[PDB]
Curated annotation (Swiss-Prot):
Contactins mediate cell surface interactions during nervous system development. Participates in oligodendrocytes generation by acting as a ligand of NOTCH1. Its association with NOTCH1 promotes NOTCH1 activation through the released notch intracellular domain (NICD) and subsequent translocation to the nucleus. Involved in motor coordination. It is found in: Cell membrane. Interacts with PTPRG. Expressed in brain. In brain, it is preferentially expressed in the accessory olfactory bulb, layers II/III and V of the cerebral cortex, piriform cortex, anterior thalamic nuclei, locus coeruleus of the pons and mesencephalic trigeminal nucleus and in Purkinje cells of the cerebellum. Residues 5-103, 108-205, 210-304 form the Fibronectin type-III domain. The modification Phosphotyrosine is found at residue 287. One of its GO terms (biological process) is positive regulation of Notch signaling pathway. Coiled coil: none annotated. The chain holds residues 597 to 899 of 1028 of the full protein. The gene is Cntn6. Glycans are attached at residues 64, 170, 265, 270, 300. Keywords: Cell adhesion, Cell membrane, Disulfide bond, Glycoprotein, GPI-anchor, Immunoglobulin domain, Lipoprotein, Membrane, Notch signaling pathway, Phosphoprotein, Repeat, Signal. GO terms for cellular component: parallel fiber to Purkinje cell synapse; plasma membrane; presynapse; presynaptic membrane; side of membrane. It comes from the Eukaryota. This is Contactin-6.
């Protein structure tokens, strides 16, 4: 028969990314055990995970091993499942829950980006890392930036693992000035790794005027097509990168608002997935990296 569960699983010592385990074997069930497997479970874990050991294979006479590949400052518990050459035994009762010792963070955030804000702002955004990779207390992000062609990095720390936006303010800078930026990590244990570099631009002035000549037309029941005039550019109005089309309705089934953007010089947008035989309003506004300008005068139509 497959073996009974191992007994008295205890962590002798635990460090940052490893631990020392000891266990007693369970009943042999007439078939000599030749294999032991260790598994692990954390709060952020789904059930139990297999885990690597030193030795990389545990034989039936092995009642001790070091577990490798643990995440620093994470709460761990371990169980041991015995194994036969006839079946796979039942898993043991978990060790007394314990937290691994802290270490500096090893994983820089992803999707580093930014742009927008005012003419005297550099706005930097990243994706806040998984909570289990803080690896210690007092965790935060290291935002590093510099003008292109400058050598010295400027940097400023941002506490809390959930934070994901930094704004640098400096009246000296000009609109859409390029910057080199990268974001790293830190905690009470010191500074961890940084991200690769990408380029982010300073902000600019919002568009000042509203698009005119707004009209709507409907050919289908799922669709209405909004139109308007392109905004002429004079340097004292903002630059117009494109147009945002707002559309709302107030029917029996619901009331909703929708946003859809077009890029460049496109002055027509067919909106899809609409409700049949329904009153819809539209309204258009120009956008650039800094946000939107004023809305146009609304128009309306009715679906087929």
């Amino acid at each position: 028969s497959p073996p009974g569960p191992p007994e008295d699983v205890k962590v002798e010592h635990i460090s940052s990314t490893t631990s020392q385990l000891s266990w007693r074997p369970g009943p042999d069930n007439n078939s000599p055990i030749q294999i032991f497997t260790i598994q692990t479970r954390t709060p952020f874990s789904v059930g139990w995970q297999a885990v690597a050991t030193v030795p990389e294979i545990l034989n039936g006479q092995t009642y001790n091993a070091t577990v490798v590949g643990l995440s620093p400052w994470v709460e761990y518990e371990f169980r041991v499942v015995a194994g036969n050459n006839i079946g796979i035994g039942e898993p043991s009762k978990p060790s007394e829950l314990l937290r691994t010792k802290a270490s500096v963070p090893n994983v820089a955030p992803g999707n580093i980006n930014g742009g927008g804000g005012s003419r005297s702002e550099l706005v930097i955004t990243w994706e806040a890392i998984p909570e289990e990779l803080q690896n210690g207390e007092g965790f935060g992000y290291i935002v590093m930036f510099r003008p292109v062609g400058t050598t010295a990095w400027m940097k400023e720390r941002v506490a809390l693992v959930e934070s994901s936006k930094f704004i640098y303010r400096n009246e000296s800078i000009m609109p859409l000035s390029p910057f080199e930026v990268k974001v790293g990590v830190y905690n009470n244990e010191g500074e961890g790794s940084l991200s690769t570099v990408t380029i982010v631009y300073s902000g600019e002035d919002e568009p000042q005027l509203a698009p005119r000549g707004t009209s709507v037309q409907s050919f289908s029941a799922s669709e209405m097509e909004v139109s308007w005039n392109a905004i002429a550019w004079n340097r004292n109005t903002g630059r117009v990168l494109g147009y945002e089309v707002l559309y709302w309705t107030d029917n029996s089934k619901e009331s909703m608002i929708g946003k859809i953007r077009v890029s460049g010089n496109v002055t027509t947008k067919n909106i899809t997935g609409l409700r049949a035989n329904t009153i819809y309003f539209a309204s258009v506004r120009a956008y650039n990296t800094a946000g939107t300008g004023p809305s146009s005068l609304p128009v309306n139509v009715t679906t087929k």
